Design a protein around this nucleic acid. Structure first.
Ligand SMILES: Nc1ncnc2c1ncn2[C@@H]1O[C@H](COP(=O)(O)OP(=O)(O)O)[C@@H](O)[C@H]1O
Ligand code: BEF
Ligand SMILES: [Mg+2]
Ligand SMILES: [Zn+2]
Ligand SMILES: [Zn+2]
Ligand SMILES: [Zn+2]
Ligand SMILES: [Zn+2]
Lengths: 374, 607
DNA sequence: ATGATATTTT
DNA sequence: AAAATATCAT
């Protein structure tokens, strides 16, 4: 019955005793494999998203430093900014589950400032009680009723607990959501939940990829950023329609005038092309003739989604190269094992790694394709 | 040093320049620098291979200074002897050191380790019924040893009294004496059946420290150094349990003897039948076949005059052969008379446990041949991070001496000089303010004072208790227990009696109005009194350690010299010239000039 | 070598 | 309550 002391000494120093570039390429190729498949799926540019956040005792856990409540709220602010930058026409609403009830914190609108301010106020609020998915969903269902039909209803629940206390049968709400054509995306924090999986699958036409649980702090940001982009629509669902809209002209005035939207003195504004009423900022529904005023730039931002730029394929090392320098940025390709040259299929012009990421994330048009004369 | 151009600024380094050796190509990885001439080692704890390097260096080197980032180690003959003792050889040591060195090891260093790594196991000493036999399996080597006139398979009985003489002599000769005892093999000595309680669990560093002692599966004598509050009592208890033989404990003070009795009972399976305490309070002795006997150094070490009732128990101690002996607070063993305890009591394995292996004289090194090599050591900073010993924010308050008081200081003689600055009215105000401020925070404060007269004077003025030699054992225990479990009595003064070997988790703050002459041992021991606070794991908690001194007096000289050990271990002292909020205090002692003059006359009348 | 302080005994 | 021996520092 001897103890571990008598056996031997650990001898820690015995444990320690005394290709990267190709590894990066193959790792990039494996990552690029997921990006190889891309097709112009039809996506609803106009959308209405109700953001539901869990503010309950489960948020007091220190899994995400400093606490789940702080990180979720902070990343929510970033999501609000990103969501309204990529999609200018869309509107958003904020709900929070606290004390076993769903509490509205900001009306569904198209002003990012209002939603940002609402989230900022929630910072100090201390989470408590149990969450209630049914109460949040019922409140979300009501909020998404006045929204126009052409808009695609969307719910993005950030669930953090493992159990839900509802006053009624949540299964009825799931059926009701499907009837109203509402798609729910759930970002779990700890582990899978049976009801959450069913809600996402039922509302997403059987797709099970809309319920995701993160595995570390870094993965949360990627999940938040993914929801920014619009979701594709199914073939069976039909929502084709026209929407009346107008483009107002910025007007400069020496004397400030009352704004129809807020009834406040503002030096400048945009004159509506129907009722000539002035609105402080865009894009918002006109306060008088309720036609959504927008600028041509707002429509432009969403064009790249309709016709995404085809992914580039790395050239084989054996084949010859078009030139020794990048077409766009003129950066010499390192001589190095495997050539680090990427060519666009349409125009067949090589590009560097920096251009490949830039030409598919920020810049949405291949420089070579525009240069090619037809 | 060949084909090397001396540097222009090489003159700044007094022959200590080491630029001749070239840096290794992989210097970015190796964490060690080796200085050839001085033998010092510089270790980077922020670089890869830090943890196992620290464990290895501690084994083969005695730490000197261990700040946060750069650790300064040194190699000595005694350190090498300890390293080779715990299952190591020159081949392994050389390979590891060269591997971890940012620069190649110089030939001078290689020779130093090589010489002392081969004499490990030539001469052995064993203990039979009551006769010591210095024997060895081989027969040729001992014949050379016997030829020497200093000493006076082969086995020969040596005089018990002269055992220390041969032990030192073996250290002097090339072959040093080894102290190993195979407790598993021998069953002739009655075995005590004891084991740790199921609830008890050994902490990581405690487990590692005990593992080194039993690395080869056989107990070996040595000294284990852990910070105050680390739990050396549990390490000793576990060491006794595994050996499964009779164990005798020698302790510095009777109060601590009671602590050992209680601690031993709380953390093991032993029953009262096998426990007896040979202290001044009671001379009860155990009549069981075997058991634990806990005593004190003074009782055992005393030679001339001991009562017959104590003599019979002492004869009982010397009669039976013991299997284990724990020399608690082993930093006083090298004293003139306490050394006799090792010789009188015949034990196969002897273990020393202390927190501050410091001694003003050169007698500290003698421990290596009285008990054994320094088996293990632990970093005070490392344990503080782990949450085992409470963090302490040391400070050194500067208390200026007033003009009237200072003038009398210069004229008085040296021995009278001490009482002028210890009773400084400015120091008195500082002590009052700190106690009042820290009592508001609900913190227990212990005010040490070596000077008995000053201790009493401060206590009487503040209406607080005190403990020192005149206090009886019953009263001293009552104050200790009361101060631990009563809200009203938040602060108690003490003296040299309580400096070392007392457990009191309640204490969190600490002050010293006066202190003994420059001595690092007392400073470290007093600081350790508050390093085991039960509320050490609470978030954002910091214990306090205040040192009140008088500016321009000899106390400043002593205080700087009195905190050297703490600086080496890692603690940093902050100078507090001004105590904010002191002026607003409604009442301050000796505020009026008349009060200061009256105190000056009173203190002057002392001598 | 001396002075403090502490401890043990009678 | 007084003796006597150790210890720790000059
Ligand atoms: N493993 C442990 N678990 C809990 N408390 C422990 C453990 N080991 C030691 N302690 C505590 O450490 C404190 C000081 O122990 P002690 O042996 O008196 O320290 P020192 O090293 O100063 O002699 C005691 O309160 C004891 O209960
Ligand atoms: F090191 Be301890 F306080 F006995
Ligand atoms: Mg102790
Ligand atoms: Zn307005
Ligand atoms: Zn209008
Ligand atoms: Zn480029
Ligand atoms: Zn192209």
């Amino acid at each position: 019955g001897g103890y571990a002391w008598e056996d031997e000494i650990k001898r820690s120093w015995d444990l320690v005793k005394v290709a990267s570039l190709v590894a990066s390429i193959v790792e990039a190729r494996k990552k690029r494999t997921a990006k190889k498949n891309i097709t112009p799926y039809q996506r609803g540019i106009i959308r209405s998203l109700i953001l539901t956040l869990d503010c309950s005792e489960a948020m007091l856990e220190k899994d995400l430093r400093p606490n789940r409540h702080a990180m979720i709220i902070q990343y929510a602010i970033d999501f609000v900014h990103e969501f309204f930058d990529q999609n200018p026409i869309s509107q958003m609403g904020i709900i929070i589950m606290r004390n076993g009830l769903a509490q509205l914190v900001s009306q569904v609108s198209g002003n990012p400032q209002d939603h940002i301010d609402a989230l900022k106020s929630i910072r100090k609020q201390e989470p408590k009680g149990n969450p209630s998915l049914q109460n949040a969903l019922e409140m979300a269902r009501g909020l998404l009723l006045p929204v126009p039909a052409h808009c695609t209803r969307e719910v993005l629940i950030v669930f953090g607990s493992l159990s839900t206390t509802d006053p009624g049968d949540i299964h009825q709400t799931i059926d009701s959501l499907v009837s109203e054509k509402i798609r729910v995306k759930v970002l779990g924090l700890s582990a899978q939940v049976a009801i959450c999986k069913e809600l996402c699958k039922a509302t997403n036409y059987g797709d099970e990829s809309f319920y995701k649980i993160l595995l570390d702090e870094t993965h949360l940001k990627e999940l938040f950023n993914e929801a920014v982009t619009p979701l594709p629509v199914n073939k069976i669902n039909k929502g084709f329609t026209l929407v009346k809209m107008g483009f107002p002209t910025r007007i400069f005035e020496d004397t400030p005038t009352f704004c129809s939207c807020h009834s406040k003195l503002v030096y400048g504004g945009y004159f509506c092309p129907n009722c000539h009423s002035k609105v402080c900022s865009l894009p918002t529904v006109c306060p008088c003739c309720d036609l959504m005023l927008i600028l041509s730039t707002h429509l432009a931002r969403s064009y790249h989604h309709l016709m995404p730029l085809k992914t580039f394929a790395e050239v084989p090392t054996t084949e010859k190269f078009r030139s020794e320098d990048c077409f766009s940025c003129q950066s010499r390709f390192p001589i190095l094992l495997t050539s680090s040259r990427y060519r666009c299929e349409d125009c067949k012009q090589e590009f560097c790694v920096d251009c490949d990421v830039f030409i598919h994330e920020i810049l949405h048009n291949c420089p070579g394709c525009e240069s090619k004369p037809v | 040093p060949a084909d090397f151009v001396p540097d222009s600024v090489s003159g700044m380094f007094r022959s200590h320049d080491f630029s001749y050796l070239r840096l290794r190509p992989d210097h970015a990885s190796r964490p060690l620098w080796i200085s050839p001439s001085d033998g010092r080692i510089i270790l980077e704890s922020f670089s890869p291979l830090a943890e196992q390097a620290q464990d290895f260096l501690v084994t083969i080197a005695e730490p000197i200074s261990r700040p946060s980032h750069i650790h300064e180690y040194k190699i000595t003959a005694y350190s090498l002897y300890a390293a080779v003792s715990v299952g190591l050889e020159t081949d392994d040591i050389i390979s590891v050191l060269d591997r971890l060195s940012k620069v190649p090891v110089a030939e001078s260093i290689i020779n130093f380790i090589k010489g002392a790594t081969i004499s490990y196991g030539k001469v052995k000493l064993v203990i039979k019924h009551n006769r010591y036999f210095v024997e060895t399996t081989q027969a040729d080597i001992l014949q050379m040893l016997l030829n020497d006139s200093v000493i006076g398979v082969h086995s020969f009985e040596i005089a018990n009294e002269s055992v220390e003489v041969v032990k030192k002599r073996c250290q002097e000769i090339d072959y040093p004496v080894l102290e190993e005892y195979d407790f598993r093999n021998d069953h002739r000595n009655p075995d005590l059946d004891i084991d740790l309680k199921p609830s008890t669990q050994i902490r990581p560093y405690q487990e590692k420290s005990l593992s080194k002692m039993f690395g080869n599966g056989r107990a070996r004598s040595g000294i284990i150094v852990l910070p105050c509050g680390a739990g050396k009592t549990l390490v000793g208890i576990t060491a006794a349990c595994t050996i499964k033989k009779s164990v005798i404990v020698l302790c510095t003070s009777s109060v601590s003897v009671m602590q050992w009795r209680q601690q031993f009972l709380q953390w093991c399976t032993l029953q009262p039948e096998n426990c007896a305490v040979f202290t001044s309070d009671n001379k009860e002795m155990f009549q069981t076949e075997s058991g634990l006997v806990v005593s004190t150094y003074s009782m055992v070490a005393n030679t001339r005059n001991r009562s017959h009732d104590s003599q019979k128990v002492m004869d009982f101690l010397t009669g039976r052969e013991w299997g284990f002996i724990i020399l608690d607070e082993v930093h006083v063993v090298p004293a003139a008379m306490f050394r006799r305890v090792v010789s009188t009591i015949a034990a196969h394995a002897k273990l020393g446990l202390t927190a501050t292996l410091v001694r003003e004289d050169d007698k500290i090194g003698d421990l290596n041949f009285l008990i054994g090599p320094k088996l293990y050591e632990a970093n005070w900073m490392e344990l503080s991070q782990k949450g085992h010993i409470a963090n302490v924010q040391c400070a050194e308050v500067w208390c200026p001496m007033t003009a009237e008081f200072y003038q009398e200081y210069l004229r008085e003689t040296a021995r009278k000089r001490m009482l002028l600055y210890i009773m400084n009215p400015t120091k008195f105000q500082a002590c009052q303010f700190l106690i009042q401020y820290h009592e508001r925070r609900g913190d227990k404060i212990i005010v040490f004072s070596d000077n008995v007269y000053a201790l009493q004077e401060y206590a009487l003025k503040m209406g607080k208790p005190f403990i020192y030699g005149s206090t009886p054992q019953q009263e001293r225990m009552n104050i200790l227990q009361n101060f631990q479990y009563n809200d009203q009595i938040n602060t108690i003064f003490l003296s040299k009696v309580g400096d070392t070997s007392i457990d009191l988790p309640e204490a969190t703050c600490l002050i010293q109005i006066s202190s003994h002459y420059g001595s690092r041992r007392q400073e470290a021991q007093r600081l350790g009194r508050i390093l085991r606070a039960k509320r050490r794991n609470d978030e954002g908690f910091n214990a306090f350690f205040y040192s009140l001194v008088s500016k321009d007096t000899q106390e400043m000289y002593y205080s700087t010299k009195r905190q050297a050990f703490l600086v080496d271990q890692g603690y940093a002292f902050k100078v507090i010239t001004h105590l904010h909020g002191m002026e607003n205090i409604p009442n301050l002692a000796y505020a009026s000039p008349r009060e200061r003059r009256e105190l000056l006359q009173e203190v002057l009348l002392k001598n």
